[PDB]
């Protein structure tokens, strides 16, 4: 009964992060000890002629990015744990997230390490036009 959501390649990392006091720190540490990034994300096929904004309603990858389903790039959604956000709600689930191609092998790690500019809508250090 039921429908699988996960693959065996992710069992170890997700179990470790599902039990951690600090899930983001646990994922960072797991990678530093040689672990593989979380796979089985929702990667989109698109025209790569989008706005390049970080978090969007539909896929918006430019030629330097890939588009992913937002819940699939969120460690808290992937582990089914509390979000550290104000009322425990996610800012990625229900949106698409654009990730620089140079970082697309680890979308979950990318979203944990980076921040979106509220003025221009692009990732700080990966598109932000405010500096």
């Amino acid at each position: 009964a039921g429908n699988a959501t996960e693959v065996p390649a992710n069992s170890t990392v997700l179990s470790f992060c599902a039990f951690a006091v600090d899930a983001a720190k646990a994922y960072k540490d797991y990678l530093a000890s040689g672990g593989q990034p979380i796979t089985n994300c929702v990667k989109m096929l698109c025209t790569h002629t989008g706005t390049g904004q970080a978090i969007t309603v539909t896929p918006e990858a430019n030629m330097d990015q890939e588009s992913f389903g937002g819940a699939s790039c969120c460690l808290y959604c992937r582990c089914h744990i509390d979000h550290p956000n104000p009322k425990g709600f996610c800012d990625l689930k229900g949106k698409y997230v654009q990730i620089p191609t140079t970082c697309a092998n680890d979308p979950v790690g990318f979203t944990l390490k980076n921040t979106v500019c509220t003025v221009c809508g692009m990732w700080k250090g990966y598109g932000c036009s405010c500096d």
């Binding site: 039921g2 996960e6 039990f19 089985n40 819940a71 808290y76």
Partner: protein, 286 residues
Amino acid sequence: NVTGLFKDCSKVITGLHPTQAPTHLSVDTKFKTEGLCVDIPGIPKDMTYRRLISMMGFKMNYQVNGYPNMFITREEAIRHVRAWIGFDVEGCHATREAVGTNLPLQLGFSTGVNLVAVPTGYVDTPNNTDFSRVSAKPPPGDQFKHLIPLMYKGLPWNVVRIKIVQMLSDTLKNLSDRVVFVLWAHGFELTSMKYFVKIGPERTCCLCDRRATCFSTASDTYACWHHSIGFDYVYNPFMIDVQQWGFTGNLQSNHDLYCQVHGNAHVASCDAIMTRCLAVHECFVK
């Protein structure tokens, strides 16, 4: 190649929208093409779902610097015999809005304590995962009859986990700097630990030099067994599965080979007492 960990137990026939699915496997077939997924204009997100996600199938086989191994060897367990606490859980089954996973109902320990929880699960929604009461029933059959009255005697998990920490602290503070849960066929005990255990690097207590055995979500602080009043999580427990020591057949048959003073009263605490007793007879008697 798929696992049962985080299986979606809802009865919804279709998968999720690409922006809401946690994984590629969980996206509905209608969005899959050319090895990836597509956004389809006019096909909306689902803004009212509640999908129960199974916690059966955790794998604690990571090797991460500075994080202790949860599962320990027989030799290490023997040195820490004073920290041994037998643990067993009787479950109930998800029903109605979900099917296909086991929820903790009666948590039993070798101290003789049984605690009863409200049937609670991890329900994915459009905004988060809601840790909430779910529809459940005891498994069918005369051997699960005693669980029927427990379906209406449960305490909420925020209360149960405080009681577990207090019981372990009272039992172990003058016996050990840790706990070793002594298990028999550990899968469901490990699923139940998700409800009351946290892990991380080895820490020291907030009020002394002893290692931390408890954590508080109220203050994000750590405590040993002596300073844990009010704390809600067990932190960095250890454990061992006695069934892996080569035994054949069920717990009771192996326990009865060495002991006659523990009659089977068919309850979680009794299985927990028999598991610790079998491990003690195997390692320390003759």
